[PDB]
Design a protein around this ligand. Structure first.
Ligand SMILES: O=c1ccn([C@@H]2O[C@H](COP(=O)(O)OP(=O)(O)O[C@H]3O[C@H](CO)[C@@H](O)[C@H](O)[C@H]3O)[C@@H](O)[C@H]2O)c(=O)[nH]1
Ligand SMILES: O=c1ccn([C@@H]2O[C@H](COP(=O)(O)OP(=O)(O)OP(=O)(O)O)[C@@H](O)[C@H]2O)c(=O)[nH]1
Length: 288
């Protein structure tokens, strides 16, 4: 399984924070927003990852994150010329994906909850079909909406329905088999002029292999689209971390716990950062 992080768009709602740079380079409490979805692909066991952004921001993600070798993974970069839809991720990434399975995650999505890694690994370990992740939300009409039966199996999926058939939004995290590339090539732009991830999901539903992992209320799927919600997301993260003395989406910690890097390698990473609390945290993990 490879992974893609779609991390472009203008981010106009956040202006002037995004006057020059992309929204996914902004802090969520104590680390850049993009760390969060990156950590989710890493916890899924995915080690070969493509980050897609705008022409002007793609090099800034590259400078921030590098090629991944210190995390024991491979990061690649590609540009999206215009934000013509989520599904364009698979066209942009066609060469990268090759004949592989692939997951897509939105650069601005933040997931958190007990047992989440098990769900991720299960999705990533699927050899066939698609896994989406549903989450009960206040205003489902603002999202992809998944309708499911009493055995948790999907009956419909609709992009921002006038009349939502359920309360469960389809969040920005998707796992696919290799059929997604030709599916994305064969869908056509909606009325808003975008290649819709919902139409990709529709294709898998028709194929009888659209699986939904429903995330209950013990999970947090956090909003980062407004200044207000960015701030709430940062406060949520702070409360979690300061109580536990454990960090959410610390990439180096994840690389170590996943076995991508060794203990000796982790200590090497902590050493040049020991003047700050993040470095000290990595060193304390090394001692665990
Ligand atoms: O071509 C694009 C289109 C979007 N984005 C970014 O992707 C994220 C999501 O885009 P957004 O406009 O906020 O969401 P919608 O496209 O309106 O909704 C999508 O994302 C929702 C989850 O937030 C899903 O529930 C919907 O099904 C799916 O269409 C944002 O950070 C965008 O900047 C890109 O990077 N490139
Ligand atoms: O090093 C890590 C480990 C986990 N996580 C994040 O912590 C959340 C819970 O992660 P898990 O799904 O591992 O559950 P847990 O740690 O609460 O339970 P144990 O199995 O350890 O008893 C998930 O959202 C995951 O992404 C990190 O951010 N970093």
């Amino acid at each position: 399984m490879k992974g893609i992080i779609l991390s472009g768009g203008s981010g106009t709602r956040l202006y002037p924070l995004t006057k020059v740079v992309s929204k996914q380079l902004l802090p969520v409490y104590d680390k850049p927003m993009v760390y969060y979805p990156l950590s989710v692909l890493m916890l899924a066991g995915i080690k070969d990852i493509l980050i897609i952004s705008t022409p002007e921001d793609t090099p800034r993600f590259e400078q921030l994150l590098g090629g991944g070798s210190e995390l024991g993974i491979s990061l690649s970069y590609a540009v999206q010329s215009s934000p013509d839809g989520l599904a364009q991720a698979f066209i942009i990434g066609e060469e990268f994906i090759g004949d592989d399975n692939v997951a897509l995650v939105l650069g601005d999505n933040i997931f958190y909850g007990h047992g989440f890694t098990e769900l991720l690994q299960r999705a990533a370990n699927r050899k066939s079909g698609a896994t989406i992740f549903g989450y009960n939300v206040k205003d489902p009409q603002r999202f992809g909406v998944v309708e499911f039966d009493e055995k948790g199996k999907v009956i419909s999926i609709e992009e921002k329905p006038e009349e939502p058939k359920s309360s469960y939004a389809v969040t920005g995290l998707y796992f696919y088999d290799n059929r997604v590339v030709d599916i994305a090539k064969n869908i056509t732009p909606s009325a808003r002029g975008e290649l819709e991830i919902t139409d990709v999901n529709k294709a898998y539903l028709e194929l009888g292999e659209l699986h939904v992992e429903l995330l209950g209320r013990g999970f947090a799927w956090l909003d980062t689209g407004t200044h207000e919600s960015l701030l709430q997301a940062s406060q949520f993260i702070e409360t979690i971390e300061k109580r536990q003395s454990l960090k959410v989406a610390c990439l180096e910690e994840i690389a170590y716990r996943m076995g991508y890097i060794s203990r000796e390698q982790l200590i090497k990473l902590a050493e040049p950062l020991m003047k700050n609390e993040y470095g000290q945290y990595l060193m304390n993990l090394a001692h665990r």
